[PDB]
Amino acid sequence: GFKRIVQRIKDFLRNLV
């Protein structure tokens, strides 16, 4: 759902941060 995808960004901040 919308929350499930939100988890995909966490991977982005993990990539950026």
- Residue count of the chain: 17
**Cα end-to-end distance, the chain, whole Å:** 25
Cα 14 to the center of its chain, rounded Å = 8
Phi, psi of 13 (to 5 degrees): -70, -30
Distance CA 9, CA 5 (A): 7
- Report the largest interatomic distance among the alpha carbons of the chain, rounded to a whole angstrom: 25
Non-local (6+) Cβ contacts of 10 within 8 A are none
Distance CA 11, CA 4 (A): 12
